[PDB]
Symmetry: C2
Subunit: 472 residues, 2 copies
């Protein structure tokens, strides 16, 4: 197991201290400082790796405790960052994100209030170092964790999060299934400095012993509350998989590939009844605004092959995603929308155009997209092309794809390969959008390259030990 | 050493037979047939792998001999595919390419005559299976070979070409330096079914014992003729590195990174004299049209960092590339133009716009471009993004980049990784351009995926054994 120091030679973990004016709380916003030679100034980069060498049985420091306690004592009807933003309040979370992004706190407040950025930050996830997702900010990367072929210990489970974030993952989704979902998710949350998302229909399905037909709103509702209480920061909910959209998939090549979308479709077809998450959307909003769980409105009809890209079914769901987004905003619930999928490069622009218009610029969250189907074993590359392109056009969060996509479960090498490919795509998108100061990273490395400061070049890279070993 | 059968289980090498009407010569155009299950028709793909299990000491069959002999007996003032095309003649080479691309022979003739496509096919490379490079055809991939840290045997040298083409390389460049350049290039040419390019200034530099100041037109001229006699199909010549463009690089971050560009710049600065390849362009054309060597007009001022992308120096050279292209066409010499380099995604469109206009749609040949500098060790990915994008916009030949770029020499794993990444980029570009029948490949694999025909899925992929091993 490599340490932070072994993964990033010449780097130190640092914190920028700022004071939240309104409360007097002192925030310590993390960054990584790369120490350089030859009189070059040290280079400061973003850091999601979190506190190091913390005993998993104890869990991370509850850094947000005093923030949450103060807001509870003041009293408030809703607990979401959007609610606070619309009241004109700059929270600790907003100031923390502003500092982390090197932007103005008012700008962060504005973006959150208008629904164009979200800060996934359940009040029960006290261990979280706040981060922001939105087109006006750095492009972010999500990594998924789940069941290992063999049951994991607590150290092994937590290491999945520590490993993905070491390489740059900005959020995690815990997609675990099986008999120990609650317990392992507790281990993850108490030991995660990054936001943690889930797809709650997975656990609800397990509560009814794998029988989709026995799902209903009530067991879904109970599952949502259970997960919110633990601290889950966002829920993927496929509320746009409407009964009347299911037949639109009949002429597809790969059908419905989304697991959550498949579950909802099966239930809807069994009873010829409308999607129960859609029907109970308002009730879901009531849950979310007591905790601040952000809603990641799923795309259950995402295309699973190039043939199916941008079809009638996909865009029918996108339209409903927009409706659900505006409805959530009425109750001050933070929203992002999930997107494709497999999409060839010439069809990527249409995806962004329609999402920006139909969903009122809510942040977009894509899986890739994969730009070709021909290379299983290399879908981190086929999708990095798509992710970089759709990111350049405004996509705010990129769900990673590993070389094992379509084939099997990812090992640690696979996870690292996936995160690195996605950090490349995300930064290439930052450059393409001319995001402030993004090119400074490239310039520092290229300067080291020109001047034969090899150690500096390696230290500045996304994966220093690979560069160093390849050179040696 | 894996065989063709081990690299591509369920595939066979086949040939499509067509008759060249004018001569009566029978052509056998190669393809790979993937045999599928469940009543699916076999899927036919492009194949550059060439004849298998041929003794390197004997060399490949001289398949073009009767074509070249007949044209010599008829008599002709020039020997280039462009000259023949402008005379209204459809050659064996044109018919072979048309068959290989599933397009009309007249269309191929038209594209070559107008300078919008080239068929690199030196009359002395009799072993060559003809292929075409141009925006209207499949996007092609070049792989580079050169010196191993330790001197190679003939089998070892030839294996570099056999390996790169097995994975899909469409052309090779032999970039060897040192004391045995002529001999090893002979081994390569007599054993290569794909076009082979060189950068002749490298060998000319070796003839003057590594002293750039002792280069001149005369030793360059001798080097060109030597290489043309062996069968080299195209020459990279940096004739656009003009004396007055050198100072335009003074404010760059990484300066002149092209090795050939650096050599010419050093010579020009030493004497304050104009580039001797530029000055003797007409004389170079006289050489090329007796053999049909295509000219790949170099970009010696290509940008070597994101900071330097699309600068005044780069575009000054591009303008001259256009002048040299039109001049070559006057003498019926086939031309492509070389391009960047390191270019961030938002600057890619300008590159294609200017090249298409200033160089009269001559085929473009890029190295990537790399879309970010931050990930040495992964520049096959940073550049695959750029290559796919610039390919989608019309770039005809993509020079590959391996994970060892900027770091060291590529081993066989590195070469394979590079070729696969570039076949992905090239095919993603084919899809983006809506190239006829390109999506059929994706559709076949995705159909196998939907139907759980695992072996078929693997057999249809770019790298079947990786997919199969990852699944198992
Ligand atoms: Co998929
Ligand atoms: Co470079």
């Amino acid at each position: 197991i490599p340490s932070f120091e072994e993964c990033f030679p010449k780097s130190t973990k640092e914190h920028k201290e700022v004071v939240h004016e309104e409360s007097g709380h002192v925030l310590k916003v993390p960054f990584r400082r790369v120490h350089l030679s030859g009189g070059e100034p040290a280079f400061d980069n973003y850091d999601t790796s979190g506190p190091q060498n913390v005993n998993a049985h104890i869990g991370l420091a509850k850094l947000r405790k005093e923030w949450i306690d103060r807001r509870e004592k003041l009293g408030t009807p809703r607990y979401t960052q959007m609610y606070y933003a619309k009241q004109g309040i700059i929270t600790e979370e907003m100031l923390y994100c502003a500092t982390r992004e090197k932007l103005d706190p008012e700008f962060v407040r504005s973006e959150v209030a208008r629904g164009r950025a979200i800060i996934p930050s359940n009040k029960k996830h006290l261990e979280l170092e706040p981060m922001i997702v939105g087109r006006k900010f750095l492009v972010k990367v999500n990594a998924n964790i789940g069941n290992s072929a063999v049951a994991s210990s607590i150290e092994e489970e937590v290491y999945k999060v520590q490993w993905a974030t070491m390489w740059g993952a900005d959020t995690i989704m815990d997609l675990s299934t099986g008999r120990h979902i609650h317990e392992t998710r507790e281990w993850i949350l108490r030991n995660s400095a990054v936001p943690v998302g889930t797809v709650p229909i997975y656990q609800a399905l397990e509560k009814v012993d794998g029988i989709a037909e026995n799902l209903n709103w009530e067991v879904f509702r109970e599952t949502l509350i259970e997960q919110a209480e633990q601290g889950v920061d966002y829920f993927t909910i496929h509320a746009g998989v409407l009964l009347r959209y299911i037949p639109l998939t009949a002429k597809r090549l790969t059908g419905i590939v989304s697991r959550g979308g498949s579950i909802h479709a099966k239930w809807c077809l069994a009873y010829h009844k409308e999607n129960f998450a859609y029907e109970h959307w308002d009730d879901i909003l009531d849950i979310c605004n007591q905790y601040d769980v952000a809603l990641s409105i799923g795309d259950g009809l995402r295309p699973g092959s190039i043939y199916d890209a941008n079809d009638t079914a996909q865009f029918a769901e996108l339209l409903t995603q927009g409706e659900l987004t505006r409805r959530a905003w009425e109750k001050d619930v933070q929203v992002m929308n999930e997107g494709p999928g497999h999409v060839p490069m010439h069809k990527i622009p249409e995806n962004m155009q329609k999402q920006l218009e139909w969903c009122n610029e809510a942040p977009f969250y894509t899986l890739g997209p994969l730009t070709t189907d021909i290379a299983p074993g290399y879908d981190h590359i086929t999708s990095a092309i798509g992710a970089a392109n759709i990111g350049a056009l405004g996509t705010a969060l990129l769900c990673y794809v590993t070389p094992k996509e379509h084939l099997g479960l990812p090992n640690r090498d696979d996870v690292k390969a996936g995160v690195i490919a996605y950090k490349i795509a995300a930064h290439a998108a930052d450059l393409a959008k001319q995001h402030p100061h993004a090119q400074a990273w490239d310039d520092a490395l290229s300067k080291a390259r020109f001047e034969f400061r090899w150690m500096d070049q390696f230290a500045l890279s996304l994966d220093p030990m690979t560069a160093m070993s390849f050179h040696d």
